[PDB]
Every structure is written in structure tokens, then in C-alpha cells.
């Protein structure tokens, strides 16, 4: 996720690697795969 | 070769070279090759310069500088020559050309192409896109 | 983790039907006795846990003949052990 | 223990022509229906590989090298037949005299099949269910046909015979058989038998990833029949000895030695 | 970061961490500060934070930044995951997903007939529409909210006797209504908005000049799956007190619209002025066969299509019903309980008209076949107009297919004769597409914007029924006739040659393994009156059909460079 609202550049990597965001359909019903932690 | 460029890039390149030449010898340093390209709009990073001197001592003479701009201009022109070569094939310009339109305009282009060579050409490949035609020309 | 080979040998007495089993030359407590007219095929059951597991050894002891010469009557006399091609394993 | 498959004997193998047969089911369990190559290996669910082309109407699946969604589930009755045409190398299925479309709609999507060693009709049955084959030894008993068959060029399997067709099945009861020397992970060989040690046979394995193994209940091929050194004692003795040696890395906790 | 550690450091360091707390619990030192929380719902919760914002940060300034980029990244990502799963609605059901559909619906409002920037959100809503169409429903009243703008939208027709609310707000409306099908909650004040839309649209086809769109006119049929004021006395106005077997629903036009249609069918009705309302509402008259089992009024369902066929039997003109033919989709559902065992005249209505169409096509094909006087001016006369009859032909064939998908059992059984007329007159493409008629084969637009596509594909369904009444014993001569037709012997010029072919020969293999059943299923007649004809029927017919399935079914591197 990270910076979802920063570089407003239309030709940025955001509009380029937008398909990389969809690349997460591998996980099935792993909505309850783990708890909730960060840094 | 060097005939890929017109007169008018070459007269511009001697205009840039003789402006920043040291004593009229035709000499520049390894700094001045950088400032002579940024004086004309072209702004390469230092890797683009880093390979061309290794390609050609510290003395960059005018035939050495002319051959380096010729390779710097031909690679983008050889990548872009083939789209404007594709423009007379289709009437609109998006890249979609008819198969019935292509057998009288491609047999008549002046390289002595018979009816047999364009018949081999299109059935080793309705309307076909533009990026496939580079895929089927360069092979 | 044993770095040595447990060798198990068995003993079958045909005229009595008495079966005993030796463990590294030390006789085990168990024994077996059967009916008169019955047959038996030698058997090993194993779940393997190595690259090399077991090895059927067709040998004789100090005063008794080996199997070879008693499975089939062309040679139920010669004491020398034999391994004819008919002896094959089954799964 | 799990399935009891059925087939025909492998000398009615068909290598050219157009043939037909129907299946009849009462319940709605798990039925496998299709054609099969003569080298049908038991203990393997059919349709999981190239050996057999089969259709499962419980969940609308066709199995060849894996499952694929095709067709609708069953109802009662389940009068299903199997089309076959080696000229164009195509297999079609019909339910209640109606061809089943593909995902996008086509002719059963089973195309480009090699003749090989012919094909045989095959059928399985899940637990508790019952099936009723009809190889077409007569014509009247064949129920729908007519609408499919006659007016496209098809004849029943046993169009002209004077006796019922014999069939086979898998038994379940295990039986001993010599080890085939193409068993993925099992290798056996003879050792000669020198001065210092008498002859033996021994084993090997492929201890790594890929697959594993269970308990190999092995046994020798023989039958010692119970009866009814000094050269004196060894020519009168009736007691003989064999030997096994468990090598290192094998636990004697999981080793059983004796007689069967 | 720790979440991305390897399996070695996520099993031993946790052990180095889990046991420390266990040591804490020793001597009573407790320090505290698989529930399906669902990361998907957490993603929705992460979307909720964006959903709770959205109009809170944008519409607060839009209706009065770099933040206007997340909407052009998250909305695109939502079109995949929702369409990727499409199976979450089966196990772990959560109404939290349905919330985002409505939470965004309020954000999708503002200008539900205009807006700005992107309209793909409407398509993104269509994707989430499939996800939906005990608790089930609660704080929402979206249907009540749907009755808001849709109310004055009925006056929009009177405001030209709202411009994209009948497009965008009617997209997901007609979708979710037609996407319902499976589940069905209830009907609380839905009929109130429906009757405020139905009766309003039932007379909205009278306003000329601006007839608006007929797309939403099919949305009434799309929503025709709820339950049971034109005549709603004890159902609309006089029902604010508080739903059993009230024998009254569409009975306000039960026999009325039936008599209206019968009178509409009785009249010519060969104009756009005809039907009109029916051309944009009588397509919903077939949806009434849903809750009514198959068809209690079986004769009504066996005549409503026949009367509709009469409207098609009226025959259009040039353009005419160019767009007025997309209602054939609903026509492929009226043939469900099609107990049209009668047919006969209706069968002839499908036959004689086609025969008239075959005669009309022959009047056009022969006008092109017998016109080779070197003139390209006939291309506008002979051709072009062929596409008019072609598109007309691609309308009745899409109805007779499903009709033959039920009239084949008893038809092929017992006897025949009835469908034999259809088979003998099914040589349409045989006298066109198979008759080397390039013009008829030049569907072009008909082939594109309206291979294997009807025409002859329909003949394959009855090809077996055609050969069913053929040789009930000895064929043979058919193969000789196939070779004769292969030599191109006209038509009747081969039958005379076929008349001289000794006789039918059969006395060996098969026969008893074939004709034995035919000698018990036929029981009709046997004479020399047949001769060819019946044998010359499928002969030349399957001949061209076989041809349609026969054959019909270097310059090196450096020189490439020059041509480039």
C-alpha cells in the first residue's frame, strides 16, 4: 500500500505498476490468515 | 556510415565544436564533451559519455565527435523509421490496415518485388495491428 | 541410533515342525511348532527408513545345510549354498 | 475398498469405425463413464491421467490429466451414452439423447485423440450405487438411440453376436507378485556370493523429496514343505537356516522377520 | 520488517518470545494491555476509512490535491478482486460487504445523472452488483432511496412531451433487478415505486417526438420478478393500514391485454405506431409465467407468442424494426412450456412464410443469377437489398431452433409427415448460401453487426429427421446420386438419370441389423411413386453440405531491410 496518495504524476510508477496491485488473488480465503501487527 | 545525417546537423556540429575548441586544433577535454552536448539540448547522464571515450587518450578530435553523434542519432531513428514507414499502409493512422489494400501498394514500391514475395510475406505472419508488423518485418 | 547391524537368523526343523529363532547367535525365548503337513515361505516385513534397508542372506551355520538345497529336490544333498534365478522377491 | 471399476476384455479393442453404448443408473452417487485404453492399471482412479477418457455427471466434470467442468449433474434414471468416431478423432457424450455443450459451446471438446492400441468401454461405481450397462446385443432394449445414432452413422457395440460379452473387474484382495524393475522408488539386485560370504539379495530407495513410502510387506518366492561339520551329521540333519541382516540406518523397531 | 521474516526466524524467535510470557505467568506476574476479523473486511475497513472520507474531503470542496489519485488506483483494483473471488457469498457471509455497496452508492450519488471525471465507477458498481444480485437487510432503504429520483423521472417524459439517471442510475438498477433471479428478500414499498414507474411508463409511449430510450422499457421486465395505480384499489392507495392470497395482480389486463393483443394481432399493426407501448412493455407480459408455475393458462402462452409471431408475420419494411428485434431474447423463454402440439397452421405460419421468404429470396437471387449483362448498377438492386431479407431471416430462425429442441421426440417417433414439409422446404441456404450465392453469403454487416452461425447450422438439427423418413431399407443409390450431383447434373436432370438405376439391392450384412427396426417403425407404404424426389431430397442437399465441410472445413534479412 504505502504511499497511495503522494506522487500525483500521471506517468508515475503508480499508473505503471497498477497491475502489480491486482497481483494478490493468489490468497484465497486467507482473510483470517494472521492477526494484526506492524513496526 | 556518416551519410545518414544531412548537411545541416553536420554544419551545426562543427558550429558547436569550433565554438568550444581550444586553439583551432580540433581538440577538447573529457569535460568539454559534456558541455558541448548540453549546449544543444541533449542531456545525457555520465554513463552515456563514459562508454564513448572507452569506445574511441584524452583527445577527442572532430571525426571522433562526429561518429559519436551519428551513433547517438541513428539508434533512435532506426527505432522510429518503421512507424512512419507504416503510415502510407493505413488511411487513418492508428495502425489498422486492410488485407485487400496491401497487395497492390506493396507490389509496386520499387524494390522489384513480384507477386510471389508479398504472398510469402503475409502468410508467414481482416486487419492486423501495427506492433505485429514490426514483429513480422525484423523477424 | 545404533551403528551396528542386528542380524536375525531363523531355524526350522522339518521332521519335527519345530521353529526357533536366533538373535546374533543368542537364542531368543520364543519358539514355534506346527502341524505335520503344512508349508511355509520365508518372510520379512519392513517399513524402510534408509537408502539401504535389508539383505536376504542365504547361508548355512556350522552343522546345518542352507536353504538352497532343500527347497527343491534335485539337490537335497549338496550342502553348498545356491541362488538359482527362481528366487525372487514379491511386493 | 473404495471403487470397483468394470471393463471389457481386451480383445474387443476397436481401432476403426463408429460405435455406441448406453449406461443406466438408479441412484445419484458417483459414476465414471467413458472409454479407456487397454492398459488400464488398477488401484488408480480413472481419468487422472492419459489412460482413460471419462465423464463424471455428479458434478459435471470430465477427467483427463485432471478434472474440468463439463455438463450438468444427474437426476434419476441417467440414460447416458458414449459417442465415438476415430475418423475425425472425436468423442461426444449424450444425456437423455441430448449432446452436452462445452463451456463456450462445442462438441464435447474431446478432440485430437490418437488410435494407439484401440479403446474399450469402461465403467466404475462408487459405494452403495448401482449401474446397468447396455452394450446393444439387441436393438429393441436400447431405449432412446433413434434420435441419435441412425441418422448420422452409428451402430451398437455388439450389433451381431450370439452370446453376452464377458467382463472383468478389480478384486481388492491383495496377492503376491514379483517386483517390476521399473518401480519408481524400489531397487533390488543380486550379489554374487564370494569366499568370504554366501550370496544375498538386497534393497535400495530414493530417499528425498517427490514422494514417500509406507510398509513394504515383502516376501520370497518359495514353499518349504514340512516333512510328512561332520559328514555324518550334515547328511542326516533335518533343520535348515536362513539369515537376514538389517543394515545401519534402519530401526529394528520397524522390522518384522519370520515365516508366512 | 518482522512480518516478512523467514520461516526459521518466525518459529524460533517466537518460541524465544512465547516462553517469556509463560515465565511471566510464573509466580503470578500477568501483564496484559481465531476470530474471523477478516483481512478482506479489514481491506474493506481500510476502504471504509477511504469510504468514510471520500465525499467528506472531496465533495466538501468539489460541491463547494494529491489525494485525488487514490481514487484512480483503488477503484481500478476493486474491479478485479470482486470479480476474481465471486464465491465469497457462500461460506463466511458478512453484511459488511453489502455496506460498501451502499456506502459508495451515496458517494456515487451527488449528480446521479451527470457527475464528472470518470464514469467507470458505474461499471465498477456493476461488478459489485453481481456480488449481491436472518438479518440480510437493515439500515439501508436503498430501494426507498431509489424511489426518489425515479419518481420525478416519470415527469421527465412529460418534461419533453434527468438525462443520465435513465442511463447510469438505470444501469445498475436494470442490472441488479435482472441479476436477482436466485435469491428474493421481499417487497416492501417496492411495488409502490414500481406502480409509480410502471403505470407512468405504461403511458409514456404516447408522447411522440421524444420517445426517449427503450432500454429502461426493458428494465420493467428485468424487475418483473418481485411479487404480484392501474387498478390497485386494495393494494396501493387504500392500503396504508399494514399480503396473503389476494386474487388480484396483473388481472387488470389478464384478459384485457389478451383481448388487446388479440385485437392488435387482428389488425395489421404493420407500423411503428402499432404496439409502441406493447413494443416497450408487452415484453414484460412473458415474465408473468414465472410464479404461475409453467403456464396455468397454457393456451394463453400458446397464443401470446403466436399473436406476437403474427406481428412478425406482418413483415417489416426496409429499416423499420432495425432496433425493434432485440426483444427476441425474451422470445427465447416463452418457448419454455411451449405446449404448441397444435402448430399445424402455426407450423405452416413458420413454413409458408419461410416458403414465401424462399420465394422472395428466389425472386431476388434469380434476379441476381439471371442478370449478368455487364452492369454494376444492379449491385444496388440485386445485392444490398439482399441484406434486408437476410436480417429478416435471422429473426425467425432464432425462434424455430428452440421450437425444434422439444418437437423432436414424438416427431421422430411414431411417424412423421408433419415435419416432412419443413425438411422439404429447409433448402433455403441450399438455394442460397450453398447455391454459390456470394451476395447471400455476403452477410458482411449481418455477419458482423447483424464460419458457424445459423443459416445451415439449423438444418443440422433436423438433418437426422430428414434422413429418418428416407430409406427404411436399401440406400446405396443415394451414394450414386451423391456422385451424380458431384458431377453437377442440374437438379431434375439427374432424377431422370436416377430413374434408370436398376433397383434397390440389399440382401447380405446389416439390413436385419437395421431395416428390421424400420420394418416395425414405418408401416406406411411402398411403391415406385417415390423413385427419386425423396431420394433426390437429401442427395443434392447433403452434397453441398459435404462440400461446406470438405476443403471448406522467402526474401532474406538484407532484402527485408530494403522493403522496410
Curated annotation (Swiss-Prot), chain A:
Cytosolic calcium-activated calcium channel that mediates the release of Ca(2+) from the sarcoplasmic reticulum into the cytosol and thereby plays a key role in triggering muscle contraction following depolarization of T-tubules. Repeated very high-level exercise increases the open probability of the channel and leads to Ca(2+) leaking into the cytoplasm. Can also mediate the release of Ca(2+) from intracellular stores in neurons, and may thereby promote prolonged Ca(2+) signaling in the brain. Required for normal embryonic development of muscle fibers and skeletal muscle. Detected in skeletal muscle (at protein level). Fast- or slow-twitch skeletal muscle. This is Ryanodine receptor 1. Binding of [3H]ryanodine indicates that the heterozygous channel is activated by Ca(2+) concentrations 4-fold lower than normal. Single-cell analysis of cotransfected cells shows a significantly increased resting cytoplasmic Ca(2+) level and a significantly reduced luminal Ca(2+) level. It comes from Oryctolagus cuniculus (Rabbit). Homotetramer. Can also form heterotetramers with RYR2. Identified in a complex composed of RYR1, PDE4D, PKA, FKBP1A and protein phosphatase 1 (PP1). Repeated very high-level exercise decreases interaction with PDE4D and protein phosphatase 1 (PP1). Interacts with CALM; CALM with bound calcium inhibits the RYR1 channel activity. Interacts with S100A1. Interacts with FKBP1A; this stabilizes the closed conformation of the channel. Interacts with CACNA1S; interaction with CACNA1S is important for activation of the RYR1 channel. Interacts with CACNB1. It comes from the Eukaryota. The calcium release channel activity resides in the C-terminal region while the remaining part of the protein constitutes the 'foot' structure spanning the junctional gap between the sarcoplasmic reticulum (SR) and the T-tubule. Pore opening is mediated via the cytoplasmic calcium-binding domains that mediate a small rotation of the channel-forming transmembrane regions that then leads to channel opening. It is found in: Sarcoplasmic reticulum membrane.
Swiss-Prot record, chain B:
Gene3D superfamilies: EF-hand. Ubiquitination results in a strongly decreased activity. CDD domains: EFh. The modification N6,N6,N6-trimethyllysine is found at residue 112. (Microbial infection) Inactivated by S.flexneri OspC1 and OspC3 proteins, which specifically bind the apo-form of calmodulin, thereby preventing calcium-binding and activity. It is found in: Cytoplasm, Cytoskeleton, Spindle; Cytoplasm, Cytoskeleton, Spindle pole; Cytoplasm, Cytoskeleton, Microtubule organizing center, Centrosome; Cell projection, Cilium, Flagellum. GO terms for molecular function: adenylate cyclase activator activity; calcium channel inhibitor activity; calcium channel regulator activity; calcium ion binding; calcium-dependent protein binding; protein kinase binding; protein phosphatase activator activity; protein serine/threonine kinase activator activity. Ca(2+) 3 binds at residues 90, 92, 94, 96, 101. Ca(2+) 1 binds at residues 21, 23, 25, 27, 32. Changing residue 133 to L: In LQT14; reduction in calcium affinity; not changed protein abundance; not changed structure; significantly decreased thermal stability in presence of calcium; no effect on RYR2 interaction; significantly reduced ryanodine-sensitive calcium-release channel activity; impaired negative regulation of high voltage-gated calcium channel activity; impaired regulation of cardiac muscle cell action potential and. The N-terminal and C-terminal lobes of CALM bind to the C-terminus of KCNQ1 in a clamp-like conformation. Binding of CALM C-terminus to KCNQ1 is calcium-independent but is essential for assembly of the structure. Binding of CALM N-terminus to KCNQ1 is calcium-dependent and regulates electrophysiological activity of the channel. The C-lobe interacts with KCNN4 channels in a calcium-independent manner, whereas the N-lobe interacts with the S4-S5 linker of KCNN4 in a calcium-dependent manner playing a role as calcium sensor and gating the channel. This is Calmodulin-1. It comes from Homo sapiens (Human).
Amino acid at each position: 500500500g504505502v504511499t497511495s496518495e503522494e506522487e500525483l504524476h500521471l506517468t508515475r510508477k503508480l499508473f505503471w505498476g497498477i497491475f502489480d496491485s491486482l497481483a494478490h488473488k493468489k490468497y484465497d480465503q486467507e482473510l483470517y490468515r494472521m492477526a494484526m501487527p506492524c513496526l | 556510415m556518416a551519410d545518414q545525417l544531412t548537411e545541416e546537423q553536420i554544419a551545426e556540429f562543427k558550429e558547436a565544436f569550433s565554438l568550444f575548441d581550444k586553439d583551432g586544433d580540433g581538440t577538447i577535454t573529457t569535460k568539454a564533451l559534456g558541455t558541448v552536448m548540453r549546449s544543444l539540448g541533449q542531456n545525457p547522464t555520465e554513463a552515456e559519455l563514459q562508454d564513448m571515450i572507452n569506445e574511441v587518450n584524452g583527445t577527442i578530435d572532430f571525426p571522433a565527435f562526429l561518429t559519436m553523434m551519428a551513433r547517438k542519432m541513428k539508434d533512435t531513428d532506426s527505432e522510429e523509421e518503421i512507424r512512419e514507414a507504416f503510415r502510407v499502409f493505413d488511411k487513418d493512422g492508428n495502425g489498422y490496415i486492410s488485407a485487400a489494400a496491401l497487395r497492390h501498394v506493396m507490389t509496386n514500391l520499387g524494390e522489384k518485388l513480384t507477386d510471389e514475395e508479398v504472398d510469402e510475406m503475409i502468410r508467414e505472419a481482416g486487419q492486423v495491428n501495427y506492433e505485429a508488423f514490426v514483429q513480422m518485418m525484423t523477424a | 541410533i545404533s551403528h551396528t547391524d542386528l542380524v536375525i537368523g531363523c531355524l526350522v526343523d522339518l521332521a519335527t515342525g519345530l521353529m526357533t529363532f536366533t538373535a546374533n547367535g543368542k537364542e531368543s525365548n520364543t519358539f514355534f511348532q506346527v502341524e505335520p503337513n503344512t508349508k511355509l515361505f520365508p518372510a520379512v516385513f519392513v517399513l524402510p527408513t534408509h537408502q539401504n534397508v535389508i539383505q536376504f542372506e542365504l547361508g548355512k551355520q556350522k552343522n546345518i545345510m542352507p536353504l538352497s538345497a532343500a527347497m527343491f529336490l534335485s539337490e537335497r544333498k549338496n550342502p553348498a549354498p545356491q541362488c538359482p534365478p527362481r528366487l525372487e522377491v514379491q511386493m | 475398498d473404495r471403487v470397483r471399476i468394470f471393463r471389457a476384455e481386451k480383445s474387443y479393442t476397436v481401432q476403426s469405425g463408429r460405435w455406441y453404448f448406453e449406461f443406466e443408473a438408479v441412484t445419484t452417487g458417483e459414476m465414471r463413464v467413458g472409454w479407456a485404453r487397454p492398459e488400464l492399471r488398477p488401484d488408480v482412479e480413472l481419468g487422472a491421467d492419459e489412460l482413460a477418457y471419462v465423464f463424471n455427471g455428479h458434478r459435471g466434470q470430465r477427467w483427463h490429466l485432471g478434472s474440468e467442468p463439463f455438463g450438468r449433474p444427474w437426476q434419476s434414471g441417467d440414460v447416458v451414452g458414449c459417442m465415438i468416431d476415430l475418423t475425425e478423432n472425436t468423442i461426444i457424450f449424450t444425456l437423455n439423447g441430448e449432446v452436452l455443450m462445452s463451456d463456450s459451446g462445442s462438441e464435447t471438446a474431446f478432440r485430437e485423440i490418437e488410435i494407439g492400441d484401440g479403446f474399450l468401454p469402461v465403467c466404475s461405481l462408487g459405494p452403495g450405487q448401482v449401474g446397468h450397462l447396455n452394450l446393444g446385443q439387441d436393438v429393441s432394449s436400447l431405449r432412446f438411440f433413434a434420435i441419435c445414432g441412425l441418422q448420422e452413422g452409428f451402430e451398437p457395440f455388439a450389433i451381431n453376436m450370439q452370446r453376452p460379452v464377458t467382463t472383468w473387474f478389480s478384486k481388492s484382495l491383495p496377492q503376491f507378485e514379483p517386483v517390476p524393475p521399473e518401480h519408481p522408488h524400489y531397487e533390488v539386485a543380486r550379489m554374487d556370493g564370494t569366499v568370504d560370504t554366501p550370496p544375498c539379495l538386497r534393497l535400495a530407495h530414493r530417499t528425498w523429496g517427490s514422494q514417500n513410502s509406507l510398509v513394504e510387506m515383502l516376501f520370497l518366492r518359495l514353499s518349504l514343505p514340512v516333512q510328512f561339520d561332520d559328514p555324518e551329521i550334515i547328511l542326516n540333519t533335518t533343520t535348515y537356516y536362513y539369515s537376514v541382516r538389517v543394515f545401519a540406518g534402519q530401526e529394528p523397531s520397524c522390522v518384522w522377520v519370520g515365516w508366512v | 520488517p518482522y512480518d516478512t521474516l523467514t520461516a526459521k526466524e518466525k518459529a524460533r524467535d517466537r518460541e524465544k518470545a512465547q516462553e517469556l510470557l509463560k515465565f511471566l505467568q510464573m509466580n503470578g506476574y500477568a501483564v496484559t494491555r481465531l476470530d474471523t476479523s477478516s483481512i478482506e473486511k479489514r481491506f474493506a475497513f481500510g476502504f471504509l476509512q477511504q469510504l468514510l472520507r471520500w465525499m467528506d474531503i472531496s465533495q466538501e470542496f468539489i460541491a463547494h490535491i494529491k489525494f485525488f489519485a487514490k481514487i484512480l488506483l483503488p477503484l481500478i483494483n476493486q474491479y478485479f478482486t470482486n470479480h476474481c473471488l465471486y464465491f465469497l457469498s457462500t461460506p463466511a457471509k458478512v453484511l459488511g460487504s453489502g455496506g460498501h455497496a451502499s456506502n459508495k452508492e451515496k458517494e456515487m450519488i451527488t449528480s446521479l445523472f451527470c457527475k464528472l471525471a470518470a464514469l467507470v465507477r458505474h461499471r465498477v458498481s456493476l461488478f459489485g452488483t453481481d456480488a449481491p444480485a436472518v438479518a440480510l437487510l437493515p439500515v439501508l432503504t436503498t430501494l426507498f432511496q431509489h424511489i426518489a429520483q425515479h419518481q420525478f423521472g416519470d415527469d421527465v417524459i412529460l418534461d419533453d412531451v434527468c438525462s443520465i439517471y435513465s442511463l447510469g442510475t438505470t444501469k445498475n438498477t436494470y442490472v441488479e433487478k435482472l441479476r436477482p433471479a436466485l435469491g428474493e428478500c421481499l417487497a416492501r414499498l417496492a411495488a409502490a415505486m414500481p406502480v409509480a414507474f410502471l403505470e407512468p411508463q405504461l403511458n409514456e409511449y404516447n408522447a411522440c417526438s421524444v420517445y426517449t430510450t427503450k432500454s429502461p422499457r426493458e428494465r420493467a421486465i428485468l424487475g418483473l420478478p418481485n411479487s404480484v395505480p392501474d387498478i390497485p384499489v386494495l393494494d396501493r392507495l387504500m392500503a396504508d393500514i399494514g399480503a396473503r392470497y389476494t386474487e388480484m395482480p396483473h388481472v387488470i389486463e389478464i384478459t384485457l391485454p389478451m383481448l388487446c393483443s388479440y385485437l392488435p394481432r387482428w389488425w395489421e399493426r404493420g407500423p411503428e405506431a402499432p404496439p409502441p407501448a406493447l413494443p416497450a412493455g408487452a415484453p414484460p407480459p412473458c415474465t408473468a409465467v414465472t410464479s404461475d408455475h409453467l403456464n396455468s393458462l397454457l393456451g394463453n402462452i400458446l397464443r401470446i407468442i403466436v399473436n406476437n409471431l403474427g406481428i412478425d408475420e406482418a413483415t417489416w419494411m426496409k429499416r423499420l424494426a432495425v432496433f425493434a428485434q432485440p426483444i427476441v431474447s425474451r422470445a427465447r423463454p416463452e418457448l419454455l412450456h411451449s405446449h404448441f402440439i397444435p402448430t399445424i397452421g402455426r407450423l405452416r405460419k413458420r413454413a409458408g412464410k419461410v416458403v414465401a421468404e424462399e420465394e422472395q429470396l428466389r425472386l431476388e437471387a434469380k434476379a441476381e443469377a439471371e442478370e449478368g449483362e455487364l452492369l454494376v448498377r444492379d449491385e444496388f438492386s440485386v445485392l444490398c437489398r439482399d441484406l434486408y431479407a437476410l436480417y429478416p431471416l435471422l429473426i425467425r430462425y432464432v425462434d424455430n431452433n428452440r421450437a425444434h429442441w422439444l418437437t423432436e421426440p414424438n416427431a421422430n417417433a411414431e411417424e412423421l409427415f408433419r415435419m416432412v414439409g419443413e425438411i422439404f422446404i429447409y433448402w433455403s441456404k441450399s438455394h442460397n448460401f450453398k447455391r454459390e450465392e456470394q451476395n447471400f453469403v455476403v452477410q458482411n454487416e449481418i455477419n458482423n453487426m447483424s464460419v458457424a452461425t445459423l443459416k445451415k447450422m439449423l438444418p443440422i438439427g433436423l438433418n437426422m429427421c430428414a434422413p429418418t423418413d428416407q430409406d427404411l431399407i436399401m440406400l446405396a443409390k443415394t451414394r450414386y446420386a451423391l456422385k451424380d450431383t458431384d458431377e453437377e447434373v442440374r437438379e431434375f436432370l439427374q432424377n431422370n438419370l436416377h430413374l434408370q438405376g436398376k433397383v434397390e439391392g440389399s440382401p447380405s450384412l446389416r439390413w436385419q441389423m437395421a431395416l428390421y427396426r424400420g420394418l416395425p417403425g414405418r408401416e406406411e407404404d411402398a411403391d415406385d411413386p417415390e423413385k427419386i424426389v425423396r431420394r433426390v431430397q437429401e442427395v443434392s442437399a447433403v452434397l453441398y453440405h459435404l462440400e461446406q465441410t470438405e476443403h471448406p472445413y522467402l526474401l532474406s534479412k538484407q532484402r527485408r531491410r530494403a522493403v522496410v
